[PDB]
């Protein structure tokens, strides 16, 4: 079940925007799919890009600069929204760090959030079913990456589902949302005051508890204003000490949190995935 | 005299957004400048990108995908707004083809447009004076390009200032605004019912009247919905016959009017200008 909002040719391929009625989210949902030239010949491998706080599918679609290299490498690029949307969906209106645009890629258990805030189930189950049903996508070759809250999303999803994803990378991820300023309150609202339930939604906690994934690429800007209190990639370096998990963590002078940083290193990430997708 | 709105590192260069008080437009005005890594060591050539209807500096800055090749080629990229701005600037509110976002790179003579709508003088005199003052730019090496109304802007400006610019290109330009549905009413409102005054602001008319410039690159999508009524690049082909003006007109299957088309062919245009900027 799917509505076509827009279709535009870019680098020989097709960048589309689509909407559907989500059952897991009880919402009409909008997402973007870029289909490369090669898809006419064969179903192509999928990279799932998960966006950060306040974003929709549009921020990366417009600014990520992924189509040139996705076209070259023959990659399908899927960009979901970041929360449920709609009049019925509850929100925290005066906090951009909570509610709409702020689903934290988890399955909410607390009221009122529980009804619509099922982003973990949406990204891992419902939307992949819809993509396979409707697009020229090889569902046996899927990878996942994202920005910030999206990097949190990408990494926790990979660690919890290692056999579903060939590779994982991130741009400025929240690697330890359980103790990060902008994510701790959200976790408490969505999941409750008892911090034990949070461990399946924290990349570091998941590693601590024995979850594994082959390796990760993480790019991080040194001038990123969120680095010290919000991001703290070193905590992930600490968590993986003594494990088999590979980490290629690159810290970049002068680069910040924005799409100017993301777009700069986008080709590296697309190649990273294409190589590991097989 | 300039204000810094934003600075962001992208491909080793700096994408900035700035504002100033414009004397020519009696407006507070915002523009974008990308400074490539080459400017760390030496003055760089400047490409001016003029945007189309409804745009600000933002559309191309976010979606044009020029920074990767601009950084590589060592090009300063300046992206002005498309009209005067402010709460007391006259407009046709719901007409996206007139007033705000629709200055047509002309100096208006008719009331009430006369007061603020001096986009030709802004782009050719005032803003270049500011750019040379505040940036490590080699003003002896300047080129100009644009999209649609901005293609009309770049082309008419080049034709009237052949010694100022080394090269000129356009994405889906309005080559003959005097007989196009979306531009003909604007010319009449800004310049008067007497079509004689429109000739200085029509690429085809300028050529007919003896204006020259070495050559133009024009990219045009075949699936562009404005092709037959608003664009008609074949009219410029006709105008340059028996003249010394060169034209490389490329017509692309499946491509439309959007930034998906513009970004696909951006590298070609940047290389075109870099070549001729020496
Ligand atoms: Cl975030
Ligand atoms: Cl930042
Ligand atoms: Cl236009
Ligand atoms: Cl179109
Ligand atoms: Mg909120
Ligand atoms: Mg208007």
Q: Which of globular, elongated, flat, extended, rod-shaped describes the shape of chain A?
A: globular
How many separate helices of chain A? 9
What about the largest sheet of chain A? 9 strands, mixed
According to CATH, the homologous superfamily of chain A is Alpha/Beta hydrolase fold, catalytic domain
Percent of residues in helices of chain A comes to: 25-40%
Q: At the first level of CATH, what is the class of chain A?
A: Alpha Beta
**First-residue to last-residue Cα separation of chain A:** 30 Å
- Written as H for each helix and E for each strand, in order along the chain, the element string of chain A is EEEEHHEHEHEHHEHHEH
Radius of gyration of chain A over all CA atoms, rounded: 17 Å
For the biggest β-sheet of chain A, the strand order reads 1-2-3-5-4-6-7-8-9
| CATH-derived topology of chain A | Rossmann fold
Keywords (chains A, B): Hydrolase, Metal-binding, Serine esterase
GO cellular component, one term (chains A, B): cytosol
Binding site for Mg(2+) (chains A, B): 91-92, 95, 98
Family (chains A, B): Belongs to the esterase D family.
